[PDB]
Write a protein that binds this ligand. Structure first.
Ligand SMILES: Nc1ncnc2c1ncn2[C@@H]1O[C@H](COP(=O)(O)CP(=O)(O)OP(=O)(O)O)[C@@H](O)[C@H]1O
Ligand SMILES: [Cl-]
Ligand SMILES: [Mg+2]
Ligand SMILES: [Mg+2]
Length: 158
């Protein structure tokens, strides 16, 4: 099954963290990375003190169950998702979200797939479009269609 995973980092200098996360994703059991989008920059839409976010999308082939994949992405967030500076470990700055899991619809306490808000987010749609321009959602909606309708601005590369 092809799973599409969104990567977000809130770090001032996120490349190291994002690379560590990518390596960890590739090490997930019964899985391998198919492709990785470019890294995209998105400024904060509010308090401008916050660093730009780094966004990307990953296609992962997996034989794991969706909730098993979630266990792994959540583990990676716990293991690579925080950075120490000086005398303190920072809070979670890495976000790994399952956007799509094959052509499956999931609605459990732990998992909503397709991701509940991705259709509102250029920062999740554009990297996904780069790696899966012909993508069709489980309900028959098309990624191209959503981008065409909402006219979200393209993202600058990191
Ligand atoms: N598709 C999905 N991918 C990842 N986590 C998901 C998910 N659907 C539901 N969740 C749930 O989301 C819960 C909270 O995850 P968080 O990462 O803290 C939310 P976030 O990603 O910061 O915001 P967002 O969901 O608005 O993008 C998890 O405990 C997990 O069970
Ligand atoms: Cl529902
Ligand atoms: Mg998120
Ligand atoms: Mg999340």
């Amino acid at each position: 099954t092809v799973a599409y995973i969104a990567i977000g980092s809130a770090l001032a200098s996120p490349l190291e963290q994002v690379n560590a996360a990518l390596k960890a994703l590739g090490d997930i059991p019964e899985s391998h990375i198919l492709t990785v989008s470019s890294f995209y920059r998105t400024p904060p839409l509010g308090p401008q003190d916050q660093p730009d976010y780094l966004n990307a999308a990953v296609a992962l082939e997996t034989s794991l169950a969706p909730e098993e994949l979630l266990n792994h992405t959540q583990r990676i967030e716990l293991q690579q998702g925080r950075v120490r500076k000086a005398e303190r470990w920072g809070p979670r700055t890495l976000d790994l979200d399952i956007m799509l899991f094959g052509n499956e619809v999931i609605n459990t306490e732990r998992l909503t797939v397709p991701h509940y808000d991705m259709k509102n987010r250029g920062f999740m749609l554009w990297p996904l479009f780069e790696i899966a321009p012909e993508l069709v959602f489980p309900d028959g909606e098309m990624l191209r269609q959503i981008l065409h309708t909402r006219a979200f601005d393209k993202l600058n590369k990191w």
